[PDB]
């Protein structure tokens, strides 16, 4: 992809008001809903469950649940046993339980062939528009950016869903970057972009046996039948040295933002739902909710292959991007799950509320998922190109450098019109197809509005069109 540096363009960026984050959020929701829609609705699963604990033969995250499930025939029912996690199952009425989202919202099963592996998505503007990338190595995330370049589209952004920690994606180029709309505003999230990744080795060691039953004509329900081996619990590992160095870097940058004698405390998420209080992420299609207290358990005072193991609970019924009336069931994956991710950033929330200063406490805050994408789209601003200019003169009637001379003076920027005028037509899953159609129609609409304006001005193909309008000194 051709990136064009804009030599002297200073451009005000605001990642917290960046329309690409709202558009990416809407696109991820639409893609999730479209991939989930043509799948099993699991209406028959909202039954009374007879759940006992999964036991060791001598004596409790998983529960062995017995239900009267429907079959391909409506006059016949089958007794089904299935292992559900405690976090998926709500106790009603001793032994009688039901699924977490059966009293509120509907739970749609993900199709068993659908892959949840994030694949880098390049968000690309239609021709006639461009995306400005901010290359300032220590960029605050807001305000004037001095090193600006233009691209048709961004680097590959993996649509990674994570909460407390940002997994995979871009790292800072020189140092940990603490970005906030207002660091003194405790209602805003603090997006930490690390310059070194912290490797997080995470697994669901359970050798789950996946069973499949029909619950209606063509409706196959996938569930855990049994565990072949020991139950254990899912967990993530980060090394003590790498994580502690990462927190050291974070406190150095926070001390740059706060007083240089401030005590910075990392503490566990003080509350909220599981998507906020734990590090919620997709590991190969399974949904992990890692306690992460052991990461944010430290008081920093201003002056070995030993890993920190984070307990992780697993959920099968997921309500991600919390919405009224929506829920998804993630089918279990046969065998043992292991994934190794890069922690490339953090979402921290400062508590505040104290008049006794010198101590600040930063707790993880899952927040919304617009912050996870903002942490990748922070470099990018969408701008509409206005290729038609008017200026006083003395007349009486490849894509390299596409927006170059934007920060240069006029005249010098009038010698580059040929390259700017070109690539305004072509540039430098129902949902994606409609967005491609909207982008192409919009690009054609703007191209033709500009060519029409040139036509009605008598400038249809001159590129530099001198006219018979005298310049009015009241204009400039």
């Amino acid at each position, epitope marked *: 992809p051709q990136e064009i540096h804009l030599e002297n363009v200073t451009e005000e960026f605001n990642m917290w008001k960046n329309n690409m984050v709202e558009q990416m959020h809407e696109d991820i929701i639409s893609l999730w809903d479209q991939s989930l829609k043509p799948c099993v609705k699991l209406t028959p699963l909202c039954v009374t469950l007879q759940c006992t604990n999964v*036991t*060791n*033969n*001598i*004596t409790g995250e998983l529960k062995n649940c017995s239900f009267n499930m429907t079959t391909e025939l409506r006059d016949k029912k089958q007794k089904v046993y299935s292992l559900f996690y405690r976090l998926d199952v709500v106790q009603i009425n001793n032994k009688e339980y039901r699924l977490i989202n059966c009293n509120t919202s509907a739970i749609t099963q993900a199709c068993p062939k659908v892959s949840f592996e994030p694949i880098p998505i390049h968000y690309c503007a239609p021709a006639g528009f461009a995306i400005l990338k901010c290359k300032d190595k220590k960029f605050n995330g807001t305000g004037p950016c001095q090193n600006v370049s233009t691209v048709q589209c961004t680097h590959g952004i993996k649509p990674v869903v994570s909460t407390q920690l940002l997994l995979n994606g871009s790292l800072a180029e020189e140092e940990v970057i603490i970005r906030s709309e207002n660091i003194t505003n405790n209602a805003k999230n603090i997006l930490v972009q690390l310059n070194t990744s912290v490797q997080i080795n995470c697994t669901r*060691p359970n050798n789950n046996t996946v069973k499949s039953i029909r619950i209606g004509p063509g409706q196959a329900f996938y569930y855990t039948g049994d*565990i072949i*081996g*020991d*139950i*254990r*619990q899912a*967990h993530c590992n980060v090394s003590k040295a790498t994580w502690n160095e990462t927190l050291g870097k974070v406190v150095k940058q926070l001390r740059k933002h706060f007083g240089n004698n401030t005590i910075i405390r990392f503490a566990q998420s003080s509350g909220g739902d599981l998507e906020v209080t734990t590090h919620s992420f997709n590991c190969g299609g399974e949904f992990f909710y890692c306690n992460t207290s052991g990461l944010f358990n430290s008081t920093w005072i201003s002056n070995s292959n030993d890993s920190i*193991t984070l*307990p992780c609970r697993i959920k099968q019924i997921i309500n991600m991007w919390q919405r009224i009336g929506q829920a998804m069931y993630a089918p279990p994956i046969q065998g043992v799950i292991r994934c190794v991710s890069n922690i490339t950033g953090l979402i921290l929330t400062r508590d505040g509320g104290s008049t006794n200063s010198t101590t600040e406490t930063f707790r993880p805050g899952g927040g919304d998922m617009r912050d996870n994408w903002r942490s990748e789209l922070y470099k990018y601003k969408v701008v509409k190109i206005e290729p038609l200019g008017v200026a006083p003169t003395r007349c009486k009637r490849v894509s390299l450098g596409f927006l170059g001379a934007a920060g240069s003076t006029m005249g010098a920027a009038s010698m580059t019109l040929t390259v700017q005028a070109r690539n305004l037509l072509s540039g430098i899953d129902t949902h994606w197809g409609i967005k491609q159609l909207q982008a192409r129609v919009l690009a054609v609409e703007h191209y033709l509005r500009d060519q029409q304006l040139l036509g009605i001005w008598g400038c249809s193909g001159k590129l530099i069109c001198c006219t018979n309008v005298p310049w009015n000194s009241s204009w400039s």
Partner: antibody
Amino acid sequence: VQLRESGPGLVKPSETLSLSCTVSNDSRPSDHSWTWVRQSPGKALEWIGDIHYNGATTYNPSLRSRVRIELDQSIPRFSLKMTSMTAADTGMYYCARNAIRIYGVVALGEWFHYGMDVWGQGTAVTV
Amino acid sequence: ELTQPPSVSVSPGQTARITCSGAPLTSRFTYWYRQKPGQAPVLIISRSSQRSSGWSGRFSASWSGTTVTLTIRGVQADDEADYYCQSSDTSDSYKMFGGGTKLTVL
């Protein structure tokens, strides 16, 4: 993987008892919970306490205040000190490897006690 | 503590059932030891695997409510011994040990 004990032949009444146990030719003594038991001859057997290489210790709550257990991490030897033991408290003292088998991550509690498989001997030393 | 009968008596060739019970025995594994006079109380029922206790053996153990039964198959004169059960506390703050049951074969 053998256990051999050591201690005095006689102790004074109401005096501190000191016993030791030597672990021979094992491969991973750091995994197991090293423990002592006390038995009154002809009567019930009871556990007195244990210690792990990670510094954790446990003691029988009825005895805890008078019993201290230590291990040497350099020389594989397991020591027991019991303050002010008398005839009504004493009995044969045995050392054992309350073996621990690890099934998952020990930091997460995913280990289960296997039991006192390998045992030494003991003498009801008193007065 | 874990209450045990003071003695049990079976004929040779029969299956012996030595039991113990107590509150912490409902949530923690029960280990069993066989002590001969003059010898150490070696293990007979050990824990192996987190979800079974199993273990190919002549012996075997059954968990039922607050009572745990040690089932000894093919009892012979060689099995005469003091049998003890052990279990950890519900918070694993200490190990609780039973008083023992004397098994005689007559």
